[PDB]
């Protein structure tokens, strides 16, 4: 309470400058979102189509969207039915009104995961460490067995249960799903939800450095060549007498 501890620096595979995202690791992370968080966490800004060029294929993406019932537009009777889910659909899930998060839990809003990595301080590092560094209370403070304990959290005391070892799983070519290995993934996915452009820019960035590494000296020499005339000018003063 009013004292804190800051996250370590985990060697993510996209922490490097010209470093792409692990897409295999974004899938696992997606799956981690679909079962676990998706019943408490909103992710309003990502859609099924967004996943297409990224992890899955066209068809794969469709079927995943088709595993929920939406609420397509009104028809003739001024109605509202329910629909298989297309691609144009986002991931708007849990509770309708905000307070429905509250009523379900106790106050406590499980903030949307569309922008989390970019919105805390310490990116995936803070989320990963909050997810992984779950621990037991030292002394002198009791919670309310509602407000679980967390060291990697402001006030070290607050709201969310550790659903990170409770294990679900579905890695086609398979991977063990420990608490840690399932955390890197939800985080490696959470980066991409907050910044889908991540990889593209770093490719341009590479071009930007390569280009500037050619243009810069080139323009210098152009400017050097024209100033030539002033750099080597010699003066002489020849007054009378």
């Amino acid at each position: 309470s009013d004292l804190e501890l800051h996250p370590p620096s985990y060697p993510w595979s996209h922490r490097g400058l010209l470093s792409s995202l692990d897409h295999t690791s974004i899938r696992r992370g997606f799956q981690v979102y679909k079962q676990v968080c998706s019943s408490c966490h909103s992710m309003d800004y990502v859609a099924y189509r967004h996943l297409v060029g990224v992890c899955y294929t066209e068809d794969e993406a469709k079927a995943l969207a088709e595993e929920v019932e939406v609420q397509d537009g009104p028809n003739e009777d001024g109605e509202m039915f329910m629909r298989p889910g297309k691609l144009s659909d986002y991931f708007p899930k849990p509770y309708p009104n905000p307070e429905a998060a509250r009523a379900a839990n106790n106050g406590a809003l499980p903030p949307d995961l569309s922008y989390i990595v970019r919105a805390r301080h310490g990116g995936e590092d803070y989320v990963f460490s909050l997810l992984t560094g779950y621990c037991e209370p030292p002394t002198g403070v009791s919670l309310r067995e509602g407000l679980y304990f967390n060291p990697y959290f402001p006030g070290q005391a607050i709201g969310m249960a550790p659903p990170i070892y409770n294990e679900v799983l579905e890695f086609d070519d398979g991977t063990p799903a420990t608490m840690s290995q399932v955390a890197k993934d939800v985080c490696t996915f959470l980066r991409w939800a907050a910044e889908p452009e991540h990889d593209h820019r770093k490719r341009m960035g590479l071009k930007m450095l390569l280009m500037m590494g050619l243009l810069l000296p080139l323009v210098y020499a152009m400017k050097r060549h024209k100033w030539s005339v002033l750099k080597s000018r010699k003066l002489a003063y020849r007054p009378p007498k």
Binding site: M211, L214, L215, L218, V219, A221, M222, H225, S232, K234, A236, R238
Partner: protein, 49 residues
């Protein structure tokens, strides 16, 4: 008396193709221009890209 006016030696700054008083600068003018123009040509190509 304006005849005492000689141009200061520039050897310190001249390109190597133009170091000899014995020889024409005509021979290397192309190459010298070639060089500097290639520099700008490439630049424009860069800026273009």
């Amino acid at each position: 008396s304006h005849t005492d006016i000689k141009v200061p030696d520039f050897s310190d700054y001249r390109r190597p193709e133009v170091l000899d008083s014995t020889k024409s600068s005509k021979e290397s003018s192309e190459a010298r221009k070639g060089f500097s123009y290639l520099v700008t040509a490439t630049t424009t190509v860069g800026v273009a890209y």
